[PDB]
Design a protein around this ligand. Structure first.
Ligand code: GDP
Ligand code: MN
Ligand code: MN
Ligand code: NA
Length: 612
């Protein structure tokens, strides 16, 4: 009801109907409509007409440009203050800090950023009241995962950014069918504003609304809410991409007994027609998308991509680890993508793709560092900062965090089961990062517990070697020690078919700084070794850090002389220091929440190293 005319926003609805929404969805929409005071409410239906009209509207506003060399491709250039996720402004809200991060023994936690409820209420009241004035509030009903999959979760994102609506349509399953499937069910509440009510108080830069000084990306897992303010960029604004898929989801998985992980999922078939599925957790810029879309060099082998970033995994009644890719598209870093490194990505992004902060060629194409493709004479390049640019000029034409956002169904090697609601059965989990020294090309963990220890000890080159356990350091939705305990607890489920755990290093370097391994499609040779190991082949040699390939077990035919002894060299001196460094890290950062079994694997590794 009402004593006046201010609580019913039905008169401001320019698409859809508040009556057609489920009761809780309406209360979420109307309550924040009253707080944000949008001029209009647009309930997205997800149709191609709605999407084409939004795009053309953004084109006429100057928000995006059409890339004329390609079919329905678009380019957005942001405010340079709003170009990436900002970890320092990304927070999780819980009653007790220890539920979100382990209390470190001596240092500041690197494993999350907690904010008290009181502090967040102040931050929220200082940001959102009236923040959508003069703007449309879009209501985005979206499903994370195949609609109706037992692994899927549903979200509702409110945003004043049409760029977000267009990118969410690619990255999620979006629209009227989600509302119908949701019904009276539960959903994650997603609230996003770029924080620039009209009339504008501050200059608009490059037609890109943002509010960098008030940017704050908050997660409230006990209220099932994500609340993000001031940034329009990717991971801050597509609330499915990381906030939902990893931070909220990891908390939900802990409560409900599954896993939400920063993992590609791929399907690999060998020359005998056997197919296995693998998940791989690499930190950003360590090659998940290359591996997931690999063009294998080994004859007779095939790789197919289920996902390149997020896996949700649940042991089913039969004990198989079933995984879905909860996303609907790829949000890949553009620079470094070349036909040589990732030809299947190049094919993917030529249609129906939104690019952000890359360079544009005079004939309407895209350009970026590492594209490794010559331009015809006469063709010129506009930088991502909307200025003319020459190859020898001393600044990148594309921002290093620039993106393509492209439908997954367009990948030429997308796996035929990539949308199966049952998911795919994972037989192998791979960890890895950039290590210039000391870590062999590949080794296999001795046990599930050692494998969990291996993920926990992951490190990766930034001149700095940083800790990034499970590749999830920016993304843990809760206490990392309890996360380790959660992973370990999988071994105690009866019937559980624990996957083999591997660790790879594509990036070992010789004394001149040259990569010892050619990588890319040649990684199909490492995958081949893992495939055989999962089948039980006797291809492994035991070492202090785990199993490595026997001499001549790796297929190195068609390669030059790869320096195998240095690529697989294991130095007592390096590993003494490595285990020392892991010890200090886990004791400091996980402290009282470190599982016993992890402390034990650490002791065991130290002891194996001491005897070599
Ligand atoms: N040397 C080497 N570099 C790689 C390999 N795979 C990927 N890269 C590089 O790592 C960078 C990031 O790759 P990407 O697939 O975006 O990693 P993601 O950000 O984890 O998906 C790219 O510039 C690649 O060229 C590899 O096997 N060997
Ligand atoms: Mn990627
Ligand atoms: Mn145990
Ligand atoms: Na712009």
């Amino acid at each position: 009801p009402q004593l006046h005319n201010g609580l019913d926003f039905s008169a401001k609805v320019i698409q859809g109907s508040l009556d057609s929404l489920p009761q809780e969805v309406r209360k979420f929409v109307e309550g924040n409509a009253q707080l944000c005071q949008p001029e209009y409410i647009h309930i997205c239906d997800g149709s191609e007409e709605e999407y084409g009209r939004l795009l053309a509207h953004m084109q006429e506003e100057g928000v995006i440009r059409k890339l004329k060399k390609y079919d329905n491709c678009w380019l957005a250039l942001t405010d340079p203050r709003d170009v990436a996720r900002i970890e320092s402004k990304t927070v999780i809200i819980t009653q007790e800090q220890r539920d979100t991060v382990p209390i470190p023994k001596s240092g500041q936690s690197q494993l999350g950023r907690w904010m008290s409820e009181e502090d967040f209420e102040k931050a929220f009241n200082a940001r959102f009241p009236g923040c959508m004035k003069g703007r449309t509030m879009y209501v985005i009903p979206f499903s994370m995962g195949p609609l109706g999959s037992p692994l899927a979760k549903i979200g509702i994102e409110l945003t004043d950014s049409p760029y977000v609506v267009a990118s969410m349509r690619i990255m999620t399953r979006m629209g009227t069918s989600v509302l119908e499937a949701l019904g009276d069910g539960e959903f994650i509440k997603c609230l996003h504003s770029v924080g620039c009510p009209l009339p504008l108080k501050k200059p608009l830069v490059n037609n890109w609304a943002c509010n960098p000084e008030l940017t704050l990306i908050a997660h409230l897992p006990d209220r099932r809410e994500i609340i993000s303010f001031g940034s329009g960029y990717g991971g801050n604004s597509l609330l499915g991409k990381k906030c939902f898929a990893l931070r909220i989801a990891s908390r939900l998985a802990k409560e409900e007994g599954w896993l939400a992980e920063h993992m590609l999922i791929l399907g690999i078939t060998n020359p005998e027609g056997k197919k296995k599925y693998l998940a791989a957790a690499f930190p950003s810029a360590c090659g998940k998308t290359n591996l997931a879309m690999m063009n294998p060099t080994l004859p007779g082998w095939k790789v197919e991509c289920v996902g390149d970033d997020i896996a949700w995994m649940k042991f089913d009644a039969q004990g198989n680890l079933r995984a879905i890719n909860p996303e609907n598209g790829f949000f890949g870093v553009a620079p470094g993508t070349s036909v040589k490194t990732n030809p299947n990505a190049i094919k993917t992004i030529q249609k129906n793709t939104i690019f952000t902060n890359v360079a544009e060629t005079s004939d309407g194409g895209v350009y970026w560092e590492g594209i490794d493709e010559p331009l015809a004479p006469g063709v010129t390049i506009t930088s991502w900062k909307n200025k003319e640019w020459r190859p020898q000029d001393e600044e990148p034409c594309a921002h290093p965090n620039s993106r393509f956002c492209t439908p997954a169904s367009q990948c030429p090697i997308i796996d035929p089961a990539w949308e199966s609601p049952e998911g795919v059965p994972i037989e192998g989990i791979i960890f890895g990062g950039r290590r210039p020294a000391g870590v062999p090309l590949v080794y296999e963990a001795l046990s599930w517990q050692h494998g969990v220890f291996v993920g926990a000890a992951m490190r990766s080159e930034a001149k700095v070697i940083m800790h990034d356990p499970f590749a999830m350091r920016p993304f843990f939705g809760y206490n990392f020690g309890k996360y380790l305990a959660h992973w370990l607890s999988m071994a105690h489920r009866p019937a559980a078919k624990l996957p083999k755990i591997f660790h790879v290093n594509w990036f070992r370097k010789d004394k001149n700084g040259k990569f010892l391994w050619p990588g890319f499609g040649e990684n199909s040779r490492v995958l081949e070794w893992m495939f055989g190991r999962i089948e039980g082949e006797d291809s492994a040699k035991l070492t202090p850090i785990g199993y490595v390939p026997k001499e001549d077990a790796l297929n190195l035919k068609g390669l030059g002389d790869v320096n195998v002894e240095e690529l697989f060299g294991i130095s007592k001196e390096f590993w003494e220091k490595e285990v020392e460094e892991i010890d200090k890290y886990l004791e400091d950062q996980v402290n009282a929440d470190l599982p016993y079994e992890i402390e034990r694997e650490l002791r065991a590794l130290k002891q194996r190293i001491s005897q070599m």
